């Protein structure tokens, strides 16, 4: 396309790979977000992270995944044209800090996140960076997965992919304990952590280091064992010294949440990757039998 039909409106964000602007198509009226990715034309070429994001988003056409609308090329820059959405879930929860977030809106948003995610998994794409700042809402009650920067197309069965993946707080315990293979579950874990956070508006496991991240999960969910999580004690970064914490009651962890909520959450936060619910399965869960789509 052409960068002459876009009128820049403001910088809505930035990142290691460039700045994000909000823009207006002068000819159609459409409002967009422009990701400008600088090209290292003498050194490293197009960033692997952009190559993945563009390639993958080009394949993921679903109403709960952010839409890449165009990629405009120069010799020296790449501009990604995305649909503009009003804000991210992080910003929203921080502004709903006192008013609170209505339960049917939470249920809607989770339901949509799961629909979006199930599409990724159905299309052999891991996201590996689900967290509130990467989830975009609009004014009509829609939410969408965004920032496929760290995503990866996967094979069946999975192989060793980058370990340095997922913000710590949203990082599943199989990565923490340092296993070779991870899969669709790591995404579900994150959404579990997100589910909890939508309800309490506090982060569920806000750890300041790796060992700390593990302790925070174990105090809340009970230190795993071989009867909960076969294979845990033989994990690379497992340490038999870990204190033996009694599992906390989900009605302390998420007081506002109903019995069905607590069930879905627990299945999302299962220690065992193999036993953790699928996005596909979670969509059937009885928590959603009465879902609607309210506006924020």
């Amino acid at each position: 396309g052409s960068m002459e039909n876009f009128q820049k409106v403001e910088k809505i964000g930035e990142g290691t790979y460039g700045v994000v602007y909000k823009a207006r198509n002068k000819l159609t009226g459409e409002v967009v977000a422009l990701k400008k990715i600088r090209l290292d034309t003498e050194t490293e070429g197009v960033p692997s992270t952009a190559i993945r994001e563009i390639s993958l988003l080009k394949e993921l056409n679903h109403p709960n995944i952010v839409k890449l609308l165009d990629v405009i090329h120069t010799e020296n820059k790449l501009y990604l044209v995305f649909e503009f959405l009003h804000q991210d879930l992080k910003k929203f929860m921080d502004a709903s800090a006192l008013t609170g977030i209505p339960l049917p809106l939470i249920k809607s948003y989770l339901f949509q996140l799961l629909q979006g995610l199930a599409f990724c998994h159905s299309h052999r794409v891991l996201h590996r960076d689900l967290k509130p700042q990467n989830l975009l809402i609009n004014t009509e009650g829609a939410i969408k997965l965004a920032d496929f920067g760290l995503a990866r197309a996967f094979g069946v069965p999975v192989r060793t992919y980058t370990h340095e993946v997922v913000t710590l707080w949203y990082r599943a315990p199989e990565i923490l304990l340092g296993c070779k293979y991870y899969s669709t579950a790591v995404d579900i874990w994150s959404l579990g952590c997100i589910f909890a956070e939508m309800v309490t508006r506090r982060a569920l496991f806000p750890g300041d280091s790796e060992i700390d991240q593990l302790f925070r999960i174990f105090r809340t969910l009970g230190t795993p064992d071989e009867v909960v999580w076969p294979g845990v004690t033989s994990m690379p970064d497992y340490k038999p010294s870990f204190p033996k914490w009694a599992r906390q009651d989900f009605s302390k962890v998420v007081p506002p949440l109903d019995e069905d909520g607590r069930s879905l959450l627990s299945q999302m936060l299962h220690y065992d990757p193999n036993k953790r619910i699928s996005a596909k399965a979670a969509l059937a869960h009885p928590f959603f039998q009465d879902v609607t789509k309210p506006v924020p």
Binding site: E42, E44, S55, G155, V156, P157, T184
Partner: protein, 262 residues
């Protein structure tokens, strides 16, 4: 096991089958290339094999590169002295897509023996991205092979290696192999590797997965059996050398069966 994505293996398979049709190159592109030939390409692909071993790259990366090249050359006429530039750039992109720790651009300039400048490699990178329109997530022979291995009961390392090896043999020869989809080559390769080491044949469970019977795999099976048999005498050997190693259970030193008994 979630590493086999139980709730998705089917949805994924269905999708790869539909996507492999869309990433498929034009079967007779070399006829329309006025200055390059199946032999020249064979040399290129064979060299990519070497590169993959020197930099210890995933086999998936090699497969992606060859996908990139064939689609590129389905759309762009290229002179012989630029064939390698196209090759290098495709390998670079494949690596950035697929590898945890891809080699730096510098390294790719190093292996063309400074045939090209770094700047040529990077500008070719951009061109290849533009030509393919960033449709890089190509289903490969390997992506089908791994999914097929799951039907083994139990798994046999020698079957896995031999099928991988037979898959890579196909990369080299656009004639005939450009006329088979990946999932077809992959099946033929798996049937042929399994038949060789065990005596068994295409599982009925894979028939039920793929819709591919032996009847449907026969044309491909015939071509591939012939490749396997003539393999020691091929002009390109890098793949045979690669699969002599203990890494791949030395399946290339295994003597091929003489008939496939229909």
């Amino acid at each position: 096991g979630v590493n086999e994505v139980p709730d998705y293996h089917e949805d994924i398979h269905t999708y790869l089958r539909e996507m492999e049709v869309k990433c498929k190159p034009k079967v007779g592109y070399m006829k329309k290339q006025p200055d390059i030939t199946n032999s020249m390409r064979a040399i290129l692909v064979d060299w990519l094999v070497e590169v993959g071993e020197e930099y210890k790259l995933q086999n998936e990366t090699l497969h992606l590169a060859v996908n990139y090249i064939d689609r590129f050359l389905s759309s762009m006429s290229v002179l012989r002295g630029k064939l390698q530039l196209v090759g290098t750039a495709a390998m670079l992109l494949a690596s950035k897509f697929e590898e945890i720790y891809p080699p730096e651009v510098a390294e790719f300039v190093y292996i063309t023996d400074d045939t090209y400048t770094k700047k040529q490699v990077l500008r070719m990178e951009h061109l290849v991205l533009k030509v393919l329109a960033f449709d890089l997530a190509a289903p490969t022979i390997n992506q089908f092979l791994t999914q097929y291995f799951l039907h083994q009961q139990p798994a046999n390392c020698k079957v896995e290696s031999l099928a991988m090896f037979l898959g890579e043999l196909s990369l080299i020869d656009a004639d005939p192999y450009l006329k088979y989809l990946p999932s077809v080559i992959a099946a033929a390769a798996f049937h042929l590797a399994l038949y060789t080491v065990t005596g068994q044949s295409w599982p009925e469970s894979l028939v039920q997965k793929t819709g591919y019977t032996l009847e449907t795999l026969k044309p491909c099976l015939l071509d591939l059996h012939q490749t396997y048999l003539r393999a020691p005498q091929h002009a390109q050997q890098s793949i045979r050398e690669k699969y002599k190693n203990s890494k791949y259970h030395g399946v290339s030193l295994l003597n091929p069966p003489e008939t496939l008994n229909v």
